[PDB]
Design a protein around this ligand. Structure first.
Ligand SMILES: *[C@@]1(O)C(=O)N(Cc2ccc(OC)c(OC)c2)c2c(C)cc(Br)cc21
Ligand SMILES: *[C@@]1(O)C(=O)N(Cc2ccc(OC)c(OC)c2)c2c(C)cc(Br)cc21
Lengths: 304, 304
């Protein structure tokens, strides 16, 4: 029992972190097989980042200009190329610590672990979610670029995120491992609007099921609702519309607890319309949306 | 920017997790050098755990009765001994993945990372605190015993906690790595009272400084207080008394932000007497006490 914001064990990812230097800029790289992946803004200077011509800036760089260091061993760069907003540096040695891995593009509302790194060295790991507006509310300082987000399925690391920038609003933006930005963001120091964010409804409901499984039941009520009535409420409180797909993915939690999805929706509707009244759920005084139904199932069953 | 409940990278600890089996009981062990550390209740059956005579139960066991498995390789047990509530199994091979390590007994209010494990396999990592009442509000299921709590200072892993049991109130109890329980707990299925818990005052104030450093300033006020007046308030709201030592440890945060400790105490006093009024601080609607001044400094400076 107990419910925590749990990250994946970061070991398999720690073994991939390297330091990438290009001119005077240093950030983190991801060494998988004989390729080092890092944000392409590593080739920029402060002046360049206003409106950089990446193709032109990369043309002034040769393999020997990219200094890749794994811990304290230098890697020999034999090739370089840009794919969207990432640089792929071919090294002459395959990472002996390369775990089994996939590159996956996550959907908004999905969660992942972040291994924050500085100078190629890991500093901390935390669990977060891709916000519906394609930002992540992480903890990143200058030097953290190239830190990655990932999930782990038994022995396979699915890399989903690479950190590229901080928005003026303190939220974070980045790409998948093919260099495609999540959201409308570009790797420039320009005016960039993070869209309207909403609350991940299916995740809040999954967290309400995690609360019941752990003893926090005060919010359960004598009411039910319909998907349409619940969606009027979710719309009013800037919550994502709940779909039949979301209802279906809550099925195992509904079966374990014996609480129908629509009955749990009526609890959430009452919590939205009335607040917590100075009470807590799983040690939180707000409605938590960074646990998916899969995360709740995994944590509550003990998947390793 | 951004502030997260961050755990240490778990890699160095993942390399130490093994599975320990004794008869029909399986739990986790910690393999450091040629010694495997695990909770001594591994030698018990459900009937034994009412009032077990550990000395007598250990006498019915030989080196060959302790089955230690590291991933999928069997370790040869050449010695066994009990130290307080832990079993130390001498194996014929030193763990090649043994990081630089220390065994430390943490103080109440101090924080640490937990690597939750089942069958010797890591499932997740989270940050938590040793509660003033010597319990931890973790996330542990049956099979998690032997999971460890740790801190990391550059390359050194300081092991502080080993998980032994769940209290009827869903909170967790365990020992340091010498087998000494934190708190009044014993490794028996008996009536065990977790004392009165209080809020870690210095940690809440450290988290208020983390909020100011990150933009959340609404709670700052035009007031100041004295240590004695603040302590009357802390006493009323079941908060730990603030000491001059706590004031001193908040010094670097006081210097960075330019907000005197007693001025921040007056903000906390107003928050305690008036509540949040439906507002949030670092994405939380309650006063967070699981970040020490050292954790805030580390996260806000970028220590790897
Ligand atoms: C990351 O470590 C950086 O290299 N970095 C500098 C930077 C990143 C991105 C952009 O524009 C898209 C600019 O524009 C000038 C600079 C940086 C910063 C500043 C913040 C964080 Br958090 C991580 C990184
Ligand atoms: C841990 O993995 C266990 O082995 N385990 C069983 C258990 C532990 C401790 C005690 O008494 C002190 C008893 O008494 C019967 C059984 C267990 C349990 C039940 C819960 C959690 Br969480 C972890 C572990």
């Amino acid at each position: 029992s107990g419910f925590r914001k749990m990250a994946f064990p970061s070991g398999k990812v720690e073994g991939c972190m390297v330091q990438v230097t290009c001119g005077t800029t240093t950030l983190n790289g991801l060494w998988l097989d004989d390729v080092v992946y890092c944000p392409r803004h590593v080739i920029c200077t402060s002046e360049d980042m206003l409106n950089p011509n990446y193709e032109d800036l990369l043309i002034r760089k040769s393999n020997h200009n990219f200094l890749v260091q794994a811990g304290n061993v230098q890697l020999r760069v034999i090739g370089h190329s840009m794919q969207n907003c990432v640089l792929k540096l071919k090294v002459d040695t395959a990472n002996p610590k390369t775990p089994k891995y996939k590159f996956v593009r996550i959907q908004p509302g999905q969660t992942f672990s972040v291994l924050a790194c500085y100078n190629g060295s890991p500093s901390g790991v935390y669990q977060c979610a891709m916000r519906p507006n394609f930002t992540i509310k992480g903890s990143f300082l200058n030097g953290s670029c190239g830190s990655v987000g990932f999930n782990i399925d038994y022995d396979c690391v699915s890399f989903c995120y690479m950190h590229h920038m901080e928005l003026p609003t303190g939220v974070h933006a980045g790409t998948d491992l093919e260099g495609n930005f999540y959201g409308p963001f570009v790797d420039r120091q320009t005016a960039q609007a993070a869209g309207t964010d909403t609350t991940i409804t299916v995740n809040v409901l999954a967290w309400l099921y995690a609360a019941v499984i752990n003893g926090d039941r005060w919010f359960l009520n004598r009411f039910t609702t319909t998907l349409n009535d619940f969606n009027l409420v979710a719309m009013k409180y800037n919550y994502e519309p709940l779909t039949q797909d979301h209802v279906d993915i809550l099925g195992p939690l509904s079966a374990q607890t014996g609480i129908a999805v629509l009955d749990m929706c009526a609890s959430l509707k009452e919590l939205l319309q009335n607040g917590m009244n100075g009470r807590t759920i799983l040690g939180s005084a707000l409605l938590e949306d960074e646990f998916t139904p899969f995360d709740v199932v995994r944590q509550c069953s003990g998947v390793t």
